[PDB]
Structure 1
Amino acid sequence: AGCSDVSTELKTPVYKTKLTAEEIRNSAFKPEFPKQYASYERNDETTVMTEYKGSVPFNKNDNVNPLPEGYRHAQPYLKNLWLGYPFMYEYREARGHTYAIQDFLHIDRINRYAEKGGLPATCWNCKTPKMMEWVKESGDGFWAKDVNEFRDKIDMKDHTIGCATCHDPQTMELRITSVPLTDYLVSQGKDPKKLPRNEMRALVCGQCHVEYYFNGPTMGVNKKPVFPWAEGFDPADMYRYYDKHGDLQVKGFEGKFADWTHPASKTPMIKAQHPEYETWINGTHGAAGVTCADCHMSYTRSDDKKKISSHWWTSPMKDPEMRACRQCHSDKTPDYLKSRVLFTQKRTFDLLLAAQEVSVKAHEAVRLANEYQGAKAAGYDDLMIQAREMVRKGQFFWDYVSAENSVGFHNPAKALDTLAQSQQFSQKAIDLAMEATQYGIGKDLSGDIKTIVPPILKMNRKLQQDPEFMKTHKWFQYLPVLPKADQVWDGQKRLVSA
């Protein structure tokens, strides 16, 4: 009934579309690829929660209010630890790619109460395939423009993360459109156009799901995104990178990178962002070459009997049958697979909260040592430098885990090890600040940290205009009261005139 042998070359299906070279509109792909598109449209589901993750974009610091405002597993100290940084205004749980621009244009991290957002146009970098036109139009001077300059120049649905981000619109071959990832690949001597399929099935995600920074004015092209990958992928490697690259002139930190100076402790801080790629790469699955697409774009046979890659990028745990996992772990029940995920997650999340607590206490200790009025130790200045270095290191280490979206599952041993080290660093900050003050600050550090430094549940750009709200917590004294101002921007809609 059938005759020729299977080929072993696993030739991928080949396409030739009616789309032009530079097509970026998502709707233009719908006519030729209705199955992948309908799967893409599944990213709209924003109601389902898992144990630690899911698609409801709740406030990550809020363990007080119910969904969709808060959640039982939230990190109560985030606004405290990000004081003086835009993340103290709003920071929500990530959801489907189809909402990327909508969520970008409603976030309070970007100033909507002035013309200028106060953030570089680099912020659009991992939001839209429009980046290609925009960089072609402005080049090197694109990055340092204000973010609000492009606010009205995008289609929020047709130009979100979509087909042109990862696919050549003519041949549909996997493509890397990312500038900073290409810069990294070229630095490793790789040709971005000629990477093996198994590499590309993780690299398309590594365009965005990574730790990054923006260049300072004397570091190269101003505000250009860079992946701090030259020393290796681990927290210790990135931290070392940030010791050698940067532009601080502050005594004890000369030439290190800083995202902000925490106004309470006066520590120059690094911010970490969602390093899925760096965490995955040397975890038990990534080291074994099991890619993002193996678990997040699993083969589905929904229409006809023809399998396509799922393009619903979400939590694998949403599936009661755990089908993605059982393509390999066919000998395990869905129930067993979930329990082994939670084995990691519960421990990771519990240790995270404890790391954040000692981090808060290290900021408080350094703040008190800074303001200390009694007799200071003879090596005070040197001890305060060291103490702030430990605050900074300790916080980057927990942020590295905190920001990463699998709650330890992508790399269990790295997550727990990084959280354990974090705690060591923050504790040493506390120890050094005590020493600097001959233990004179000890009595101020005695209780539970939750009553010494209360969690900051509420903070936004509107409330920081209110001078009576700004007396509501001890750490607010270190922030300016913002000028009274009407909202300029409502999403894409301009409310006041330029």
Structure 2
Amino acid sequence: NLKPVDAMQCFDCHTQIEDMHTVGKHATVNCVHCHDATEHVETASSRRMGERPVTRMDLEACATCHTAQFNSFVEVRHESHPRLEKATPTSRSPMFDKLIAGHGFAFEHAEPRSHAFMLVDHFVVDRAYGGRFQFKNWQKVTDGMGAVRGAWTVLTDADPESSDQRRFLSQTATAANPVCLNCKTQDHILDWAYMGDEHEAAKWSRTSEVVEFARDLNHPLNCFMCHDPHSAGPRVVRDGLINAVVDRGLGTYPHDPVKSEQQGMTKVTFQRGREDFRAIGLLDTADSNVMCAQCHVEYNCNPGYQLSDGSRVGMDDRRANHFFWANVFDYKEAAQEIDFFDFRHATTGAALPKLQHPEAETFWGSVHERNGVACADCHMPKVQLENGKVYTSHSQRTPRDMMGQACLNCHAEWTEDQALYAIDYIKNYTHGKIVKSEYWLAKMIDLFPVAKRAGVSEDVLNQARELHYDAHLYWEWWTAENSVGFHNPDQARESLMTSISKSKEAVSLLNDAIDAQVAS
């Protein structure tokens, strides 16, 4: 049984915590729920930590008083098909392997499944750790609660004796690095300096051995990623997001200065040895658009190359942890502003960006976003109970599972079937354009070896490579983005038509150049 500690004693040294804790809705929640600080209190001074207190980061620390939210979070949506590869004819990107050739995603890229699995899925995907980590057996893939209890309760490491990234199976990659983990867990929140920069007080950083870092991490999507444990108020903890919104002053809604001001973020910095160490972003309001944008964004979390000179940009560089915080039509400019690209296409040699799940940036400017709707309205609605205390569902899943609460409450003119039909109209239309964009990209890509072998000049190949960048960007955004156009159908339409235009331009350029070589 827990025994309370005297928080006044802590507050003597922890003024920032005092100011948060005493004012919020956790003012009566004793520190012992999450911290074991006995030896810390015996040894600390006002500027030196002394013995490190233990801080609980398990979600059960919150589930004791918030079982409803915890249970809704950990529910596994069995209809979210697991380990479903996107590069197949029946999934999101039928020609993905040809289009992404040269990139680590060619090894495996599955559709997302329920949040409980995020950390385990990150660890076991074929592109991440060379196949080092596996579930203990193939039955464990169902065990959401187990994954939440801790990744290492359900996973095995092929070689606990080594800590290097290497292939354990031939068709795997070792793309994982420490930045990835920031969107899977915040178990490292006290051990990682802001942005993963080198820091005396940080156990882990962008340049750490990711296998060793992995072994230290257990829990997915900690509840405190969106809720300050001290004030219980809304926040974000993701460094990349704070950096974009606050440090770079882009604001929470870069396209709406007024909304950015009303629904803003306040950066709170915590120090170690009186030197800035870590930060959180306190939100003005409980704005799930910004909470979900901690992870559902396009980002860099990887080494890459400079657009200017093609030189390597390694994990040690700040750019290896970066939120572009730019919609699809501002993205090329945002990548130019940091002088960065992700990979060279294996066939065309083009410098290309790699886009990932840009839901937050896609949502900006959509009809729903403009009308003050937020992710949670459709994906974590309040529960409707005939007789019950209302709480917010933490199931984070498609509104198809709860259309009454997620759509039909606003769309009184529709039945569930009508609303589903509206969704399907958009997704079907968008998917048709994605498929057409891929057809044209693939047609362009296939001409590169023919052009090279026909003696087409490097100048013409480079012209086509520049078009490839744009054709790729304006296509890939939409296979990366999870709503298949729903979050912003007009933007998807304009973008995908732009992709096709670019590819058609490249096809015509290469075809003409090949024919001119043949004629000469």
Q: How far, CA to CA, are the matches of 2:504 and 2:188 in structure 1?
A: 43
State the shift of 1:435 in Å. 3.1
The residue that corresponds to 2:283 in the other structure is 195
1:24-52 CA-partner distances (Å, limit 9, x unpaired)? 2111111110111111121x23x21xxxx
Alignment match, 1:394: 471
Superposition pairs of residues 34-49 of structure 1, within 5 angstroms: 34-42=67-75, 44-45=76-77, 47-48=78-79
Shift of 1:13: 9.4
2:151 maps to which residue? none
The aligned counterpart of 2:51 is none
The answer to whether residue 110 in structure 2 is matched with residue 14 in structure 1 is no
Query: Do the aligned residues in 2 keep the contact of 1:144 with 1:224 (CA within 8 Å)?
Result: no
Q: Which moved more, 1:16-25 or 1:234-243?
A: 16-25
TM-score normalised by length of structure 1 = 0.73
For 1:485, the equivalent position in structure 2 comes to none
Q: Which of the pair is proportionally richer in strand?
A: 2
One of 228, 237, 245 as aligned partner of 2:338: 245
Counterpart position of 1:56: 82
Q: Are 2:218 and 1:130 equivalent residues in the alignment?
A: no
Post-superposition CA distance 1:358-407 (Å, at most 9, x none)? 1111111123212224xx4xxx3332211101111101111111110111
8 Å contact kept, 2:471–2:500: yes
Which of 97, 105, 130 is the equivalent residue of 1:112?
130
Can you list the C-alpha shifts for 1:399-424, whole angstroms capped at 9, x where unaligned? 11111011111101001111110000
How do 1:69-148 residues align onto structure 2 when only pairs under 5 Å count? 72-112=90-130, 115-116=164-165, 117-136=174-193, 139-141=196-198, 142-148=205-211
Where 2:215 maps in the other structure, the secondary structure is coil
SS in 1 for 2:367: coil
CA separation of 1:221/1:243 partners in 2, compared to 1, >3 Å: closer, same or farther? closer
1:93 partner letter: E
Counterpart in the other structure of 1:284: 367
1:381 pairs with 2:458: yes
1:403 to 480, 490, 508: 480
1:218–1:399 CA distance, 2 compared to 1 (3 A): closer
Amino acid at match of 2:211: N
User: 1:113 Cα shift?
Assistant: 5.9
Q: CA deviation at 1:227?
A: 1.3
The residue aligned with 2:292 is 205
CA separation in 2, counterparts of 1:441 and 1:59? 40
RCO higher in 1 or 2 (8 Å CA, sep ≥ 6)?
1
> Alpha carbon RMSD of aligned pairs, Å?
2.6
CA distance in 2, matches of 1:137, 1:202: 22
Structure number with the higher helix fraction is 2
Matched residue type, 2:296: H
Separation in structure 2 between the aligned mates of residue 168 and residue 137 of structure 1, nearest angstrom: 17
Structure 2 counterpart of 1:170, one-letter code: H
> What is aligned with 1:351?
433
Query: 1:436 and 2:513 equivalent?
Result: yes
> Taking structure 1 as reference, are residues 330 and 162 closer, same or farther at Cα in structure 2, changes over 3 Å only?
farther
2:449 to 367, 373, 387: 367
For 2:518 and 2:98, the matched residues in 1 are separated by: 20
Match of 1:182 among 221, 239, 242: 242
CA distance in 1, matches of 2:341, 2:103: 11
Report SS of the residue matched to 1:308. coil
In the alignment, the residues of structure 2 paired with residue 338 and residue 136 of structure 1 have an alpha-carbon distance, to the nearest angstrom, of 44
8 A Cα contact 2:298 2:324, kept in partner:
yes
Whether 1:227 and 2:310 are equivalent positions in the alignment is no
Is the alpha carbon distance of 1:195 and 1:111 closer, same or farther for their aligned partners in structure 2, counting shifts above 3 Å? Answer: closer
Q: How far is the alpha carbon of 1:226 from its aligned partner?
A: 0.8
Distance 2:518 2:453 in 1: 10
Partners of 2:426 and 2:127 in 1: how far apart? 31
Q: Mark the CA change 1:398 to 1:137 in structure 2 (over 3 Å): closer, same or farther.
A: closer
* Residue 139 of structure 1: how far off its partner (Å): 4.8
**SS of equivalent residue, structure 1 residue 398:** helix
Q: In structure 1, what is the equivalent of residue 155 of structure 2?
A: none
Q: Is the contact made by 1:398 and 1:422 (CA closer than 8 Å) also made in structure 2? A: yes
Alignment of 1:168 with 2:225, yes or no, is: no
In structure 2, the partner of 1:314 is 397
Mind listing any 5+ residue stretches in structure 1 that lack a counterpart? 1-11, 49-53, 64-71, 247-256, 443-498
Partner SS, residue 132 of structure 1:
coil
In 2 relative to 1, CA 139–347 (structure 1 residues): closer, same or farther, beyond 3 Å?
Answer: closer
| Structure 2 unpaired stretches of 5+ | 1-22, 36-54, 133-163, 166-173, 199-204, 252-264, 268-280, 305-311
For the 8 Å contact 1:365–1:441, the answer to whether it is kept is no
| Count of aligned pairs | 393
